[PDB]
Amino acid sequence: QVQMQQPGAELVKPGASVKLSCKASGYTFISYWMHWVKQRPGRGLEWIGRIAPDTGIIYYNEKFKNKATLTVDTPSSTAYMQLNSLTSEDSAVYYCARYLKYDGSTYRFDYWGQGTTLTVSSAKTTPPSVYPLAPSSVTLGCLVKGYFPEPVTVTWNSGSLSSGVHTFPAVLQSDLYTLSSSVTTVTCNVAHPASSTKVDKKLVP
Amino acid sequence: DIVMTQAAPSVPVTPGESVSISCRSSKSLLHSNGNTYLFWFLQRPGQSPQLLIYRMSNLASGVPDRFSGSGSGTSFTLRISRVEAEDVGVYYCMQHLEYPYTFGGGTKLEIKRADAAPTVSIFPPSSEQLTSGGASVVCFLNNFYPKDINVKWKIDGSERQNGVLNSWTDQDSKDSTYSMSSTLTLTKDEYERHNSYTCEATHKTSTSPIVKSFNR
Amino acid sequence: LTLEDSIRQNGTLTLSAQGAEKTFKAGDKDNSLNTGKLKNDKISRFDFVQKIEVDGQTITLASGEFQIYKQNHVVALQIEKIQDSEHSGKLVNKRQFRISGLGGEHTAAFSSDDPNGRLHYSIDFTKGYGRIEHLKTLEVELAAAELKADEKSHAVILGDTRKGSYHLALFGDAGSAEVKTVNSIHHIGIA
């Protein structure tokens, strides 16, 4: 099926460059343009530019003329996007989206990448510290403290337990992040893509 | 550049009723070919934007029949005939008639539901954290309405004003409810010097506030 | 009878007229048409649509009018809506005139929105000069040249236009001409 894979997160020092990738699967890759969208933390979706793997042409937003560089590799079915001279205002999530070069289809922005959370800062990646929170319904917690940077993927019982789950937004204290998650043979599954860590903690008395 | 305006920042609605989300453009999105190039998108929290409506009125594959599209030149509206709780989120309009493609501001759908009480859960610091030199007491305010709630801490009967970090969830995709988590960050030292810890929640649900506590 | 050069990107060709539509899919020999069964010495006009399928959906690449000239042994395609797959990504209303026909060849008139054109040319077997008039364009002359099989196994004039290029193919016991004026490069046909 159509699948578009994006790296979960990427941290780099300010003033450097980064080349985001977006792999493609399940469709005739050369027939579709590739658009890139930035969603900063808070609100706002900006359209950056499109690249055509068939014609090689890039149409770009003037605001990202010297900030973004769009390249494509048809053999690997991957599109890239290089961000340059990175500042603090570039800390954001970046999406890819397919767009058929032809008018009259249902194949335009109908599939979106999971997003790449790009954090640009001078700090260093810290894997999370995971602590299970335990005391007709039972509430169980899971503390994910002192990680950097965002995001993380808290999950219970490998996704089997999905109703009654309450994952809370992170808090930035002392340069590192921290969240908690609740739910009402129970396993807390935390992942930190930036440090490439997966932690599975069981909740027991 | 074409400017897409979503005048309503957020709209409230009760489950089962009808909602209308609107969007205005700086120039007619009608091309000479007669096709109006407008998209409607739904962004659920922590997820990628999802196509809902294309060509201003045509429903997209996988989009429920509740969603409806209408519009003219410089005026466009998305309609949900019967609003369910799964429709909570931010709705974005977008033009693709001219480069640069431009989005709208986004209108958040808010669900007005029946007032409900928070469910306190309290948690002692774990043995692993205590061994690690840290101590975080963590309190949960689960499944309440509305988002306006307040939190107080009692260390051995006295209030605490330092290291109290709080986090709020968005509207539940099913319960249409909110949730909150307050965490008191202590050291392994001063946590070991106190016996009674209490987490207190104040809400419109009850005149008498709810507090749950624990003692080691 | 069979027109394979009129199909684009190995797709389809839905010609439709008089409440009937026949789709000539490339790669199959079953596609055929009138071998002069339509009225001779008359331009018969059809409404054509060129389509391909990408990832399980048909997309119209072009559409417009499709006119033919009938003899014992020239297909013309007036595109009215073509797609700008390079820049806009939209089906624009660009009008262009092309010629994509052939018939039964031997071995050894119309223009863009101008149906009333006269082709008066003569050639003698010296080894093809002709005059074309009755058109919006003022004063066009086909330049005489030799003929040969030219790997097509059929005699070809391959003349010029008066700074131009013309091609006429012999048949029986048919042509296309390219001219460049100040306003635009006009495509003319021979029959």
Q: Which residues contact A180 (CB under 8 A, 6 or more apart)?
A: A133, A141, A142, A143, A144, A168, B138, B140, B167, B181, B183
Contact B25, B4 (CB under 8 A): yes
Q: Are residues B105 and B139 in the same domain?
A: no
Chain C nearest C-alpha distance from B200 (Å): 58
Query: Do the Cβ atoms of C90 and B31 come within 8 Å?
Result: yes
User: B37–C90: do the CB atoms touch at under 8 Å?
Assistant: yes
To what resolution in angstroms was this structure determined? 2.9
* Cross-chain Cβ contact C86/A100 below 8 Å: no
- The answer to whether the CB atoms of B37 and C92 lie below 8 A apart is no
Domain parsing of chain C, residue ranges? 1-106, 107-191
Contacts of A114 in chain B (CB under 8 A): 48
Please answer whether residues B49 and B113 qualify as being in contact, where contact means their C-beta atoms are separated by less than 8 angstroms. Answer: no
Are A195 and A127 spatial neighbours (Cβ–Cβ below 8 Å)?
Answer: yes
| Pair B56, B74 in one domain | yes
Tell which of B41, B181, B199 to mutate to test the A interface (max A CBs under 10 Å).
B181
Task: Output the DSSP codes for B122-176.
Answer: EEPPPHHHHHTTEEEEEEEEEEESSS--EEEEEETTEE--SSEEEEE----TTT-
Q: Which residue of A has its CA nearest to B97?
A: A103
Domain boundary among B46, B80, B111: B111
Residue-range domain boundaries for chain A: 3-120, 129-202
Residue A55, chain C, CB below 8 Å: the answer is yes
**One-letter amino acid identity for C19?**
G
Q: How many CA atoms lie within 13 A of B129 on its CB side?
A: 28
Residues B124 and B147 in one domain: yes
**Token pair belonging to B199:** 């987490």
- Put simply, the answer to whether C90 touches B33 (Cβ < 8 Å) is yes
- Inter-residue contact B169 to B215 (CB < 8 Å): no
- Smallest Cβ–Cβ distance between A100 and the set C54, C60, C86 belongs to C54
Among C57, C60, C87, C88, the strongest candidate for a mutation testing the B interface, having the largest count of B CBs within 10 A, is C88
Q: What is the topology classification, in CATH, of domain A3-120?
A: Immunoglobulin-like (2.60.40)
Neighbours of B (≥3 Cβ pairs closer than 8 A)? Answer: A, C
- φ, ψ for residue B129, nearest 5 deg: -65, -40
Q: Do B35 and C90 touch (CB under 8 A)?
A: yes
Per the CB < 8 A criterion, the answer to whether B194 and B216 are in contact is no
CATH assignment at residue B54: 2.60.40.10
Residues B100 and B160 in one domain: no
Closest to B167 measured CA to CA, from B191, B139, B206: B139
Q: Domain of residue B52: give its range.
A: 4-111
What are phi and psi for residue B24, nearest 5 degrees? -120, 150
User: What is the distance between the alpha carbons of residues A114 and A78, in angstroms, rounded to a whole number?
Assistant: 15
Q: Give the tokens for residue A11.
A: 């941290």
Q: Would you call C91 and A103 a contact, using CB atoms and an 8 Å cutoff?
A: yes
Q: How many CB pairs under 8 A join B and C?
A: 11
Give CA B157 to chain center in angstroms.
34
Optimal mutation site among C51, C53, C57, interface A, most CBs of chain A within 10 A: C57
Q: Say whether both B107 and B14 belong to one domain.
A: yes
The answer on B27 and B95 residing in a single domain is yes
Give the count of domains, chain B.
2
Is residue C93 within 8 angstroms of chain B, CB to CB?
yes
Please classify residue C113 by burial: count the beta carbons closer than 10 Å to its beta carbon, then call 0-12 exposed, 13-18 middle and 19+ buried. exposed
d(CA A56, CA B40) in angstroms, rounded, equals: 28
- Residue A63 backbone phi and psi in degrees, to 5: -60, -25
Q: Which residues of A touch B (CB under 8 A)?
A: 35, 37, 43-47, 59, 61-63, 95, 103, 106, 108-110, 112-115, 129, 131-135, 139, 141, 143, 145, 163, 166-171, 173, 178-180, 182, 184
A111/chain C closest Cα distance in angstroms:
14
Alpha carbon separation from B43 to B89, B122, C16, C167 (Å, rounded): 6, 33, 43, 59
Q: Looking at the structure, do residues B73 and B10 belong to the same domain, yes or no?
A: yes
Q: In whole angstroms, give the CA distance from residue A93 to residue A113.
A: 11
The reply to whether residue C81 touches residue B35, judged by beta carbons under 8 angstroms, is no
* A31 and chain C in contact, CB less than 8 A: yes
Angle, alpha carbons A192-A196-A199 (nearest 5°): 55
Work out the minimum CA distance from B6 to partner chain C, whole angstroms. 26
CATH number of A129-202: 2.60.40.10
Token pair in block for residue A148: 């950097």
Note whether B125 and B165 are same-domain residues.
yes
Q: Are strands B19-25 and B4-5 parallel, antiparallel or unpaired?
A: antiparallel
Same domain for B96 and B142, yes or no, is: no
A163: tokens are 């109703």
What three-state secondary structure class fits A159?
Answer: helix
Cβ-based neighbours of B122, under 8 Å, separated by 6 or more: A135, B137, B139, B140, B199, B212, B213, B214
Residues followed by a gap in chain B, C→N > 2.5 Å: none
